[PDB]
Design a binder for this molecule. Structure first.
Ligand SMILES: [Cl-]
Ligand SMILES: [Cl-]
Ligand code: NA
Length: 129
């Protein structure tokens, strides 16, 4: 599913990402934008052989099992394919585990490089939340 900008913000708010660990909704929306362009089916091979999955490009190196990433962990205890579902529950629930690791939203390379410090509020502008 390719989510609309406000449509995704609404799903993310309902799952409790608005200010999760101090990160305002706008940050989660911006991250999604640049990680997957709001496309739940997005998959991208990392140079280390791991793959990133879903709307928030959760890494098979540490977070979900895809059976082809040697020596990796499956910290969210899910098959990476669960992260490509039209329903973002699984991706969100896991992102909550990732953003809590101490390694805040910096674990999302695109967020660090393209959202951090910016006016992430613009990402929710005009949305009924
Ligand atoms: Cl594996
Ligand atoms: Cl933080
Ligand atoms: Na894995």
């Amino acid at each position: 599913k390719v989510f609309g900008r406000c449509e995704l913000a609404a799903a993310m708010k309902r799952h409790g990402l608005d200010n999760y660990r101090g990160y305002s909704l706008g940050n989660w929306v911006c991250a999604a934008k640049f990680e997957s362009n709001f496309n739940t089916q997005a998959t991208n091979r990392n140079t280390d052989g791991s793959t990133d999955y879903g709307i928030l490009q959760i890494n098979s190196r540490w977070w979900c099992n895809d059976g082809r990433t040697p020596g990796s962990r499956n910290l969210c205890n899910i098959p990476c394919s669960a992260l490509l579902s039209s329903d973002i529950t699984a991706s969100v629930n896991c992102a909550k585990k990732i953003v809590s690791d101490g390694n805040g939203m910096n674990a999302w390379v695109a967020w660090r490089n393209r959202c951090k410090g910016t006016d992430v509020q613009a990402w929710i502008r005009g949305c009924r939340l």
